[PDB]
Write a protein that binds this ligand. Structure first.
Ligand SMILES: [Zn+2]
Ligand SMILES: [Zn+2]
Ligand SMILES: [Zn+2]
Ligand SMILES: [Zn+2]
Lengths: 355, 111, 151
């Protein structure tokens, strides 16, 4: 009954994932990572520490976000001891955020939360943010209480006016205030306020949270952006960079002012334009067109092939692990189907199928 | 309620946690043509009742009017109070049989 | 080895009828095997009460072991010492198991318990006395330790 339970749990997961839709999602993103050094995360119920796995899993999320969404920029606000602090603003450089993260790892967490203060300076940080740059904040919380210098509802309405969507990730259980926050922040949706159950589910929550979010019609931002690629030149001399003014062997040229910069994806510092490459924009085409799930055929029918169409391994008999792409009508094994849906972004069976 | 009975035929009686039913036609000289009870056909249980007869120290607990001022059992009770105070997300209520006894225990607790 | 480790349990029983060791048996069936041994001197008889210590060894080689499992509640003659404890004391589960060792039947099985130092062995003995509830005395070859366990 183990395979039957696995099949019915996969059916529940498939019922959750039936809504495969090509929604327009948040691409030009601006993120704020609200963190807390409070005394609640000192508890050794988590091994070695709540703050410990917060540190490593935050580093992992930084890497995953800079990979999956390179063109976006993310900031870090730290809560500690009655007043929140800023350690990393929004940047295309993950190195600064990583150095701040390991500085927080070196230091000790202690304090008590002021979520109104955190939200207020987060509002100040997202204040000079362009309209196409979507404003989103991630929230972690290890407690059940927060004192604040003033009322929170004016802040709530003001941030709703600032057109923001926010996910909140609590530690213990659901809190009505945070539920209301995600509700009003996310147009009545309360799927944005989720609580973990263990570290595996926690990491799964991170892996979900790296992904972009679909956007609505009513908050329409249909416009154009003035983009331009730089030209990398492998130069023969140590040369000054525009930003840090240090001598570099080679690098890029600005498409307009011909200045050089250390890294991509970054804006120009001089004529002030976003300079990316084709990798950054190609990174989300699998968002732009998704990959619909593959038809797991039953063992009752006769099959076109009894071995895998892709990895070329023989199919088993009690259950039929022959998973057929509807866009290609070729059955594949569970291993290849899971790997293609998690990594790959084209069906070789559909490459075989002529159109 | 007797003039209510002889004044109105369609006298219909309901409540939430009236269990059992039989002593109410005893305490009130009446009868019903029919009476039963209803329990919900809920999907999964979301109210969680359990009976605690002992603290984490495994000490028997009671609120009798004689042993109400027993400081060891008081300390056990406040250990429970501490442990729900650490974990309460939104709201939590405690009742006692007698308000004087509440004021006594809360007075010495604050003390 | 286990099969040969089968004894005449419940078959020999010494009772102290007010400082008088009456060595009963549960049946006259035990008496026929016992009379084969002649070191000595339902059915009891005269034994030198100091010689009981040696004839317990003797019955260990002749494999009919006596048991000591006190029916204090059925011994109404000895005055009970009904003394309890406070609820603030906490018995650890190994102490609870130790209390279950001589109380598999509720009759006070006599034996040996050795525990590590500082394990509240005094408290375990106090609990054992408070559940035995009869006249009882405490012995130890010292003075300062004895008065401090009195304390
Ligand atoms: Zn530079
Ligand atoms: Zn430029
Ligand atoms: Zn395969
Ligand atoms: Zn296909």
């Amino acid at each position: 009954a183990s395979l039957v339970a696995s099949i019915v749990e996969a059916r529940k997961k498939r019922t959750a994932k039936k809504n495969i839709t090509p929604y327009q999602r948040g691409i030009i993103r601006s993120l704020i990572l609200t963190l807390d050094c409070s005394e609640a995360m000192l508890e050794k119920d988590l091994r070695p520490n709540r703050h410990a796995m917060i540190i490593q899993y935050a580093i992992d999320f930084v890497h995953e976000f800079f990979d999956q969404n390179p063109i976006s920029q993310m900031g870090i606000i730290i809560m500690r001891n009655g007043l929140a602090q800023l350690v990393s603003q929004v940047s295309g450089n993950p190195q600064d955020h990583i150095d701040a993260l390991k500085s927080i790892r070196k230091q000790e967490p202690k304090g008590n939360p002021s979520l109104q203060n955190a939200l207020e300076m987060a509002r100040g940080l997202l204040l000079p943010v362009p309209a196409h740059c979507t404003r989103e904040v991630l929230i972690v919380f290890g407690s059940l209480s927060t004192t604040d210098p003033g009322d929170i509802h004016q802040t709530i309405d003001s941030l709703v006016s600032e057109k923001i969507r926010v996910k909140v990730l609590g530690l213990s259980a659901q809190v009505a205030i945070c539920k209301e926050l995600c509700k009003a922040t996310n147009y009545g949706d309360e799927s944005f306020y989720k609580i973990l159950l263990d570290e595996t589910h926690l990491k799964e929550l991170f892996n979900e949270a790296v992904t972009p979010l679909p956007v609505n019609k009513i908050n329409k931002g249909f416009t154009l952006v003035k983009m331009g690629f730089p030209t990398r030149i492998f130069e023969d001399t140590p040369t000054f960079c525009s930003c840090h003014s240090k001598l570099v062997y080679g690098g890029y040229f600005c498409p307009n002012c011909h200045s050089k910069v250390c890294s991509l994806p970054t804006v120009c510092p001089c004529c002030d334009l976003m300079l990316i490459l084709s990798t950054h924009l190609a990174r989300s085409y699998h968002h732009l067109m998704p990959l619909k799930t593959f038809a797991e055929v039953p063992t009752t029918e006769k099959f076109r092939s009894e071995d895998c169409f892709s990895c070329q391994s023989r199919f088993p008999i009690l259950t039929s692990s022959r998973y057929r792409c509807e866009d290609c009508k070729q059955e594949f094994c569970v291993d290849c189907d899971v790997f293609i849906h998690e990594i790959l972004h084209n069906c070789p069976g559909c490459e075989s199928k002529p159109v | 309620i007797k003039p209510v009975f002889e004044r109105f035929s369609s006298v219909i009686i309901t409540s939430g946690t009236i269990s059992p039913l039989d002593m109410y036609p005893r305490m009130l000289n009446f009868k019903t043509v029919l009476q039963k009870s209803y329990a919900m056909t809920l999907a999964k249980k979301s109210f969680l009742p359990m009976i605690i007869t002992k603290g984490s120290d495994q000490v028997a607990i009671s609120s009798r009017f004689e042993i109400r001022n027993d400081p060891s059992i008081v300390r056990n009770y406040g250990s429970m109070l501490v442990e729900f105070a650490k974990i309460t997300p939104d709201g939590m209520v405690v009742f006692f049989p007698s308000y004087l006894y509440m004021e006594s225990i809360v007075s010495m607790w604050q003390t | 080895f286990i099969k040969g480790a089968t004894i005449s349990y419940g078959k020999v029983k010494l009772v102290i009828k007010h400082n008088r060791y009456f060595v009963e048996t549960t049946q006259a069936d035990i008496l026929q095997m016992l009379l084969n041994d002649s070191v000595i001197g339902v059915h009891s008889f005269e034994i030198a009460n100091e010689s009981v210590e040696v004839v317990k060894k003797r019955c260990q080689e002749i494999d009919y072991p006596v048991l000591e499992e006190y029916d204090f509640r059925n011994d109404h003659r000895n005055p009970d010492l009904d003394i309890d404890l406070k609820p603030s004391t906490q018995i650890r589960p190994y102490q609870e198991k130790s209390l279950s060792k001589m109380f598999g039947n509720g009759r006070a099985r006599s034996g040996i318990i050795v525990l590590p130092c500082g394990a509240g062995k005094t408290l375990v003995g106090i609990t054992a006395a408070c559940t035995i509830k009869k006249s009882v005395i405490v012995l130890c070859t010292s003075s300062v330790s004895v008065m401090q366990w009195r304390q």
